[PDB]
């Protein structure tokens, strides 16, 4: 609703060719703050955002210890998953998983998550009520009772409702000014000379945060879809994000167009128009 | 009687020695959690195994070590014993919901050297005729004396079958010489029965005191016989008087 | 990281009372109450999972807050005599490990319905008679003092339960060395009931 925190897991078995490899990344909204790579002789959780560095030794050890155990466990999980699907040792397989907690504009838990995939496909995920599971197939059903029997739900719920939000709130206060900065876009629109027909009008949105933004071109308050070429949102490499829609349609009367781009970094929805 | 199976329950050894405590988890449990409680101290987490497979490490010492074998049973090995190792080690078997089911623990007594180990003598003391007249209750008293160390369990067997009603054995032993530490111990137990019960000569009374001492193969170079684990008994039949 | 409050606990039979347990945890996976007798290893009584949760159960009621748990014993009987353990799990560590509290040692003094304080002397069944003197059937209030004598052994006391006849009974024991020890004076340091039957 407002802020969120997720963790991402991969457990990849190298085609019959060795022990599996466990990775974990910590996300707050879109900022990445910790990473953990199984592959090394002295694996350890590492900072990724400046505001996590202040955290103490015991915290880094609690992380390192869980991802170190997860490493061990997920190998046995990979051995059980492949066993279900009668896959051979060689043998390139992957289980990914993302859980976390959602904060509203107030600062309380809106909902939590614990989904899984195996080999890129939805497997088992926690229902909104934080009590029930959803299995993909008869195999993910085998995993569901494994998990009901161990009451995993009741404990993910205790983490979601408790610790998770707890820490979210914590980081939030610590990395505020970057986490609660909300930077607006430097917008404009341009065109190249040698195009198909008329100006290659390009609606731009740059250096903004977070990623939430909306473009759409109009014919005096309109919604095109078919007449505008849109592009997906990318990072600027420096925490900021980018995105553009555009128009190069065969008809061009030049000065008579709008591009309503609204974002939580604006005091109002922007109307835009360029002058040579 | 939870499910966990611990052996040996009693061990007595010399300093700088090695012993190894076994343990078998509850059928269906795959884990094994080793614990140490130091007489009048708390339970400190030692180490823990899952299926293979070392899963966690509490505060086990450089000097101690353990494994969990293919089946599931664990073995904790305690090398270079110190006097302050003596204690209770509790194995546990987690799961699945997942409470921890503990074992009956195994009590380790580590000594300077064995020479000061003695088996209990036992005597039964018949009910006072005074008590019988005045209360028509008959109180036998069992006295277990001169033993080392603090490793006994006293039990009353009446006509071959142990009993628990009318019996009260002391919560702790008593130093025969408080001034020494290696002071030997004494322990007492009351069996009370109806006057008429005690007045029946066909009624048999035996006070059983099980001693946990020196182990099968161990070096005994002292004059007297060897203080091995053994039962010591005193007996008496009912006086119709 | 888990402390239990009344270390020692000394209750008269019938006198309710709540044993405390505090806890500091990253996130609470579970809180467990165990009962341990001397010798045996901890038995399971309860698990509590969420702040506000309570569980039955017989005389013992268990309670969870944000900061600690309470085990309220109602109408303690003597057989509730054990030390009681408190353990937590924590969502911040993997596995199922427990960190235990120190423990609350509970002793229920039994009620004695009809005191008949006496001190009897007993024949050693073996040829060698060693007498041993038996203070018995006294009430709750009279406790047995130790001797500063090097050669007189005085036990602590305990309650014979004749479940068969609804009849409880206290007692202590005292032996030593022949002359200058004839029993009508074994329990001589202890505050003995004015009415004590001293058979001749």
């Amino acid at each position: 609703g407002s802020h969120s925190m997720r963790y991402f897991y991969t457990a990849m078995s190298r085609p019959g060719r060795g022990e599996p490899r466990f990775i974990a990344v910590g996300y707050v909204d879109d900022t990445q703050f910790v990473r953990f790579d199984s592959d090394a002789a002295s694996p350890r959780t590492e900072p990724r955002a400046p505001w996590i560095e202040q955290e103490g030794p015991e915290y880094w050890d609690r992380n390192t210890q869980i991802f170190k155990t997860n490493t061990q466990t997920y190998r046995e999980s990979l051995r059980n998953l492949r066993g279900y699907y009668n896959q051979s040792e060689a043998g390139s397989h992957i289980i990914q998983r993302m859980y976390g907690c959602d904060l509203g504009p107030d600062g309380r838990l809106l909902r939590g998550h614990d989904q899984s995939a195996y080999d890129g496909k939805d497997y088992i995920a926690l229902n909104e009520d934080l009590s029930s599971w959803t299995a993909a197939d008869t195999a993910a059903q085998i995993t569901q009772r494994k998990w009901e029997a161990a009451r995993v739900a009741e404990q993910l719920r205790a983490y979601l409702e408790g610790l998770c939000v707890e820490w979210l709130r914590r980081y939030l206060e610590n990395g505020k000014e970057t986490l609660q900065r909300a930077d607006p876009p430097k917008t404009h629109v341009t065109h190249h000379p040698v195009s198909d027909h008329e100006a290659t009008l390009r609606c731009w949105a740059l250096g903004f945060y977070p990623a939430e933004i909306t473009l759409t071109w109009q014919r005096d308050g309109e919604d095109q879809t078919q007449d505008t070429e849109l592009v997906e949102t990318r990072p600027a490499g420096d925490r900021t994000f980018q995105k553009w829609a555009a128009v190069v349609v065969p008809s061009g009367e030049e000065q008579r167009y709008t591009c309503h781009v609204q974002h939580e970094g604006l005091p109002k929805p922007l109307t835009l128009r360029w002058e040579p | 009687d939870s499910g966990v199976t611990q052996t040996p329950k009693h061990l007595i050894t010399a300093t700088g020695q090695r012993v190894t405590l076994r343990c078998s988890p509850r059928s269906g449990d795959l884990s094994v959690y080793w614990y140490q409680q130091s007489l009048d101290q708390g339970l400190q987490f030692l180490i823990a195994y899952y299926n293979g497979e070392e899963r966690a490490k509490g505060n086990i010492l450089e000097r101690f070590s353990a494994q969990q074998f293919p089946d599931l049973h664990s073995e904790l090995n305690l090398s270079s014993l110190e006097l302050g190792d003596s204690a209770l080690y509790f194995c546990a078997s987690s799961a699945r919901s997942g409470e921890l089911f503990f074992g009956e623990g195994s009590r380790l007594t580590v000594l300077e050297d064995l020479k000061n180990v003695f088996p209990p003598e036992v005597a039964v003391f018949e009910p006072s005729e005074a008590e019988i007249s005045h209360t028509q209750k008959a109180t036998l008293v069992c006295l277990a004396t001169g033993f080392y160390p603090d490793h006994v369990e006293l039990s009353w067997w009446v006509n071959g079958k142990e009993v628990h009603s009318g019996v009260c054995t002391d919560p702790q032993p008593l130093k025969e010489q408080p001034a020494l530490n290696d002071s030997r111990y004494a322990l007492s137990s009351r069996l009370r029965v109806s006057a008429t019960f005690w007045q029946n000569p066909r009624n048999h009374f035996r006070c059983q005191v099980q001693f946990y001492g020196l182990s099968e193969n161990d070096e005994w170079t002292q004059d007297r016989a060897k203080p091995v684990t053994q039962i010591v008994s005193a007996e008496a039949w009912g006086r119709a008087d | 990281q888990v402390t239990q409050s009344p270390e020692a606990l000394r209750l008269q039979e019938g006198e309710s009372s709540s044993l405390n347990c505090s806890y500091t945890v990253s996130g609470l996976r579970g809180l467990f109450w165990y009962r341990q007798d001397p010798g045996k290893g901890p038995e399971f009584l309860f698990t509590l999972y969420s702040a506000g949760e309570e569980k039955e159960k017989e005389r013992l009621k268990a309670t969870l807050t944000k900061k600690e748990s309470f085990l309220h014993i109602t109408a303690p009987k003597p057989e509730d005599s054990a030390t009681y353990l408190c353990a937590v799990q924590d969502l911040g560590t993997s596995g199922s490990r427990l960190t235990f509290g120190e423990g609350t040692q509970l002793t229920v003094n039994p009620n004695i319905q009809n005191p008949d304080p006496a001190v009897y002397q007993l024949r050693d069944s073996k040829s060698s008679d060693k007498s041993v003197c038996l203070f018995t059937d006294f009430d709750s209030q009279t406790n047995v003092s130790q001797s500063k004598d090097s050669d007189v052994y005085i036990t602590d006391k305990c309650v014979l339960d004749m479940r068969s006849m609804d009849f409880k009974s206290n007692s202590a024991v005292a032996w030593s060395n022949k002359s200058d020890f004839a029993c009508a004076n074994a329990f001589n340091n202890s505050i003995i009931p004015e009415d004590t039957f001293f058979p001749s």
Binding site: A24, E76 | - | S26, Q89, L91
Partner: peptide, 11 residues
């Protein structure tokens, strides 16, 4: 902060 997985938490 990462949740920790108890025993028997495998797939």
């Amino acid at each position: 902060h990462p949740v920790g997985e108890a025993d028997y938490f495998e797939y």
